[PDB]
DNA sequence: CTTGACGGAACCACACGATGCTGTAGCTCGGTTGAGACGA
DNA sequence: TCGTCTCAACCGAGACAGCATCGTGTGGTTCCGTCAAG
């Protein structure tokens, strides 16, 4: 890709594949001159170490790049990447319709509901507000819809509150400890930027209010909302999976 | 008495008197920089380690097969021309040259004084000096980065136990890890089968006999001198033995030793006791008779070659047998050399290691060390000898300082502390004697978790090592270039190259992990990041290499390493801190001072004591009973002698502590009541104080420790007074002071300018500023505080603010550890914070079309065009909303392949078909503030924007204004000096004329000086700076967000009580007392039993007492009483049980009114860490101000109104503000641009990405018995092509079908698998 | 360590003897390349 | 044990290379001229010391040493292949010049990801050599102004020439020693790959399709046939003069009044310039 | 756990918020606090230490 | 409903280097493998 | 007297110049899309 100032951003796999391409071209240009045994032995050994540097790195080749000290990345670092021998889809997976925030406690809310600020409520319900705005009959376009949700209009809360009262949301702690770290709740319309939570679920979270970074999740289809309210709604996972004690534990 | 103490004095409670003032905090890096740089010195510089010591070891050189020499007398330091306030706004990174003078002396290659052609000339500037400031930091390309003291392992050899699962034994010896300063890492592992085998980095295991034969020592002499010293002879009764009483001690003698002319010593079957040892000592019989069966177990030292036979009858280091003794008897051997080993003595493991693998030749050891370095190569003796010499003897790519030889001499035992920097074979003899002494069991094993085994480094030694590496690289390059050259054919300047040392000093600060970014969000972070002691980096242990060895502490850290200061997270224990009174040694050793005490009296002098003598000497405790006579009243005190706490006698100790604050670092010591808290939550509170942010209104802390003024004094953001005098005029941009006639020179008496730091950007995107706290017409002293920085007020450290605080679980708002605020903190803007947000936009040049700062940007509405000018930059101080275009950047495009829909919507509106896109940067979501300034950088000889012209003209008129005001103050000082001079005997005349001419010469010199200063400022501001290649103009806009209190902010106190605020509750819902002041921030009472810190209650009680005294002095000032009542009030305050009184000194008209106006907003305390305020003075301070004695207030219910049938506790808690807000962490993304290797969203499209849905997230998702959301979140939210399109069409149209489809993850997998040629097909 | 110090002392003594035995100092420019 | 490497094995294999007098090489070059597979084999298997001596000088580059010894023996066999023995001189200098040409081609083609011809890498090489000569006397960072003043070249020309030198680093070596996050998940592609962009594209296409179906038939025909939106090609009124309307001015007035009608129904539908183009 | 096991889910989770609300109100109108007189120190501790 | 004029693409010839090729001759802990030890 | 049964190290994870076309810049006419004028 073109970078800032005419520069480029390449991976090391381009360099190793270009190197084995040039070594095979030199093999093609050397095989047609009645070559002796020693130089074709050396060239086949060179192609052997070349394709060994193609498949793996850090065993016997130890190839270095120009003007640096880090070794190049083979195709093992494309099927795996970093973090040991774990795959690239298994090392990191940035999921859409998410975003990290800090949490706070809300004591005036029930177990079947929660709080959520409007600044993220305008975006976590974005296909829902697009469908409602194109179905009710106020704005059939999507660019004017983006303009009216970025302009902070007065009617966006009135047309947005229909999918706040009876629509589940997911919330997961970024340090994951057990299966109660993900939950399901019902938002309301409040002010501010951070998220109010149920008090009696932080003991199930094993997450005291220490100002961490908690990410939210919103599934797209309503079938996933129905099954999330069936599987991880807080009126269902009352008992802990360890023993017969409930995971909702009363605090001091 | 300072001038800041007249405005604010602190009531201390230290029962122990202060015997030593707090030293300089950043003096270690200061004198390390002074030793490495050597800026101020005479013609004879110091012979210590540094850049001069690195240059003198390399700069004398000799050409191979030629005649060349290079001499030098010294170097010349460069003058720093770049100002700090202009390099943080321009990007010069404090460039400073360093020129050296080299003498190119040639010879005739005959070792005589013939053809002496010397060329003494000054060379080019070898790189650029960092040129750090007096505060202890240096700027590296715009940002400020600092160094960290590398707490790696000390240079030398250690001997630990290291009991692990690999040895599978109860008692085993660990491997001797020889640690040099740089390079040549050698290992010595002790094999469990009575052997020793050395190790290398890539080579296999090698025996110690081959290593000794490669070093130079023969195997026979080493095997002789390793075990013992005993000779065997054949005389008299067929054998002659040399009896040693030391070896026979504790050995069961199974044979008869009745020789000694009829005197039997030990019979057969009798254990040798001390009585037989004393009998042998009083007898002195050196010859004893043993049978031949005892000689079978013995092992020879060298080979027995008889001169009469002519052949080798016994091999070297072999056992003696029944035929071998008969052969040695029949060969007429007079003296037999063999070793004598016993069971009670040391085990003969060195002989068994030397007898292994048949290593007895020097050529075999040479080819073994050649195969260990370069296996499968041509075995040459000269090449292997040169490789071994460059690895061990020569200093090529190997630098060892004298501290490694000093530690080796302290380990193996030597009278000389200073040793040679090059390693020799004699050190190998000492380390083999040390390892066989450790395997014998005598002595004590070394501890790797000790302060002696972990040396604290600095920037000077690593910078000298990097400069030495670059200098030997440049020397090798110059020797390769000047190989075939001559003296007249080449040049001495053209042969040298300053490029490798410049690249080395570039990578030492740019790509090094030790030169990380300085935490400048808080002054506590600024003073602690210098004093960090990290074990990571090069030559140290990383996070996964810590284990259970370096994460533990030994009691030899008494006053050296503070364990209550380390960052929490994935690394606790290996990154340490430096203590307060701990001062490093010349050898880089961590030492702490101790008070020498005799048996009767107490001495006055203090000596800095190391750690090697504290294991032999007794260290007492300073917190003891003293009757003002120099003796301890108690007969038993907790002392420590052998690095372990015990009880001792007062006439037996020799040393004691200087101050109780010498063990804690400067991070944790600012928390009051450390002795009432646990170290866990005090460490957590110190970490949140290090990660703190400043506030808007800097309110003084209520409960203070006393070192707040000290840490405000040593901080570089404060204004320190160089010279005293009266103050003429005070301005928020600059301040000037007058110079008295005592501390001044003859000419240029009054010259003192102080540019206050304006609102610029820190490293953690927070604002920094200087506020003056003085008046007009007052005198100051040396080191006085003129203007305080952020989170500092009126000379002391004032981080946060205080409010009324009670301990009550109120309606679940403070549920577990949470916070419940009140409307006063949002109505008075108390704990609000303002961040400066950076936005770096580039204007590069592309091959298809250049870019520029043009205001004519397509797709720009009225609200965006009204903010920006005809140039393209928004004006200074405009309101920036969410989604605003700030900078002007238009990029061109060609062959875009536009769709018919885009040209249709372009032709409907009638707009022109603009082929140039708009890639101007905008603000992220949640940022709505006001910009303050914009910094623009252009290239040399390029077109400049008109906004850049306005910026540089504003900067030049500001510079000319401060130059004019300093010229005005210096001409006013000269005129008032002349007017004070002419009044003496006005009514001789030649003197007055002379003085007027001298004053005219002085003001014309000052005028031409400000003219050349303005010329330098013009030539430095009009020129272009060194920027990135391919960039035409670099702009950066400084957006300031006026963030307020929002529901969900982070709020923690000082004792490690983390909490989040819930909502904005009003001032009436909180419970109130009968006085009229309702409580503001209510906390939970779980912080005291669960977290083991009761200092919350004591701090809030002293805060309640301090607010009671403050309200009493406020209503006393309101009641308009006389100064006698105020001084009696101060007398009854400052006459408690703890501390001392400093009254009856201040004057009533000036200083009493000054302390009243500067203490009406609260009073500070001064408590030490381990001998602080007791509880009875707190009960007195509670009971003297019409407050209850136990904090048992009677409160009224604001909610229900029912009377509480229980007394409650209220008070004042001084809490801190954290950098854990929501706005910097908020990611607002519904749909994001997918990646290139798969269809997963990521950042880069002006929207932050989501979280990592890794293995544990999907594991907790399938923890329940469900299957539909697991595939819905995997094929709809990501990893599809048309599935998201058909699902969005089903969402818009309303009807749902839930088609399965085919994801692209299977396509990426089948391509990555078929890239290896794998048959995959479907049956169906 | 000691060998480099002895070589430095010998080179300094030889340079002092050359400067005191008729030899002079050639002051080249600070910025000059062949 | 034994070494499981390749460089050591190569160095042990090249130890059987003889070095006789020059008459043996003269006889081998004379036998190789007529055509025989023995003199070329001896010249390729007995002259590797100069090859490894050439390859040892170009160390610390973007290639491996096996590539350097391979271009060395490739240049040597290309030198002795088309070798003319009429000069009567030593072929070691000819093999040295051929190995220099081959290592220049190896620097040209195996260092940077963007390939370059001979002349641009030659002017880059002499420009970096001149910068290396001037930075010893400048004692500062090299700027293009002094290079343009010394080389008698314009500043924009040498800036465009130094802009080709990208020197791209890796995508796994991040900033700092602790590489907890790579650079693969940092930057995205420049093309529109977001579901928001394609979603706005299909919604705008369906919107203009509904607005063309809700308009008149002639206006929808002249708006679809001119731009090629509703299943039409890239033809206009000059090509549709025998399809829709013969007069170009009449269909142009029809087109601009249809565009005005579309603009006024977008204005009545809540679509303006500031709400569409920010 | 007992009332959950004997009534199911809905009555348990509607009892939970009401118990939480009355616990929050009875914590708000309560008046306990940990003070300096809360930590009672016996006189026999110094005797045991001596 | 007709007419004539200018700015912006649209292949295409000319072309100026420019691509392309060629000749000089001196940390803890689990799977693998070579080596000693005992009975039929 | 030899096959099999343990057993401790080994390894790896969380230069220079010349020759033969050549490919898009640089207009070059030409077609097209639009702008007044009745
Ligand atoms: Mg937490």
Numbering used by the authors:
A (entry chain D): 253 to 504
B (entry chain C): 3 to 989, 1020 to 1356
C (entry chain G): 57 to 90
D (entry chain F): 57 to 334
E (entry chain D): 606 to 655
Publication passage describing the model:
To understand the molecular mechanism of SutA activation, here we determined cryo-EM structures of RNAP-σS holoenzyme at 4.1 Å, SutA-bound RNAP-σS holoenzyme at 3.1 Å (SutA-RNAP-σS, open lobe) and 3.9 Å (SutA-RNAP-σS, closed lobe), and SutA-bound RNAP-σS promoter open complex (SutA-σS-RPo) at 5.8 Å. SutA anchors RNAP-β protrusion through its RBD and wedges open β lobe through its wedge loop to facilitate RPo formation.
To better understand the action of SutA upon RPo formation, we incubated SutA-RNAP-σS with a duplex rrn promoter DNA (−49 to +21) for 20 s and immediately applied the reaction mixture on grids for cryo-EM data collection. However, we only obtained one major 3D class of single particles, from which a cryo-EM map at 5.8 Å resolution of SutA-bound RPo (SutA-σS-RPo) was reconstructed. The map shows clear density for upstream promoter dsDNA (−35 to −12), 14 bp downstream dsDNA (+4 to +17), and the −10 element (−11 to −10) of non-template ssDNA of the transcription bubble. The cryo-EM map also shows clear signals for SutA-RBD that interacts with RNAP-β protrusion as in the structure of SutA-RNAP-σS (open lobe), but no signal for SutA wedge loop, SutA-NTD, and SutA-CTD, indicating that SutA-RBD remains bound to RNAP upon RPo formation. Structure superimposition of SutA-σS-RPo and SutA-RNAP-σS structures suggests that formation of RPo closes both the β’ clamp and β lobe of RNAP. Loading of promoter DNA likely displaces SutA-NTD in the main cleft, disengages the wedge loop, and resumes the flexibility of lobe domain necessary for subsequent promoter unwinding steps.
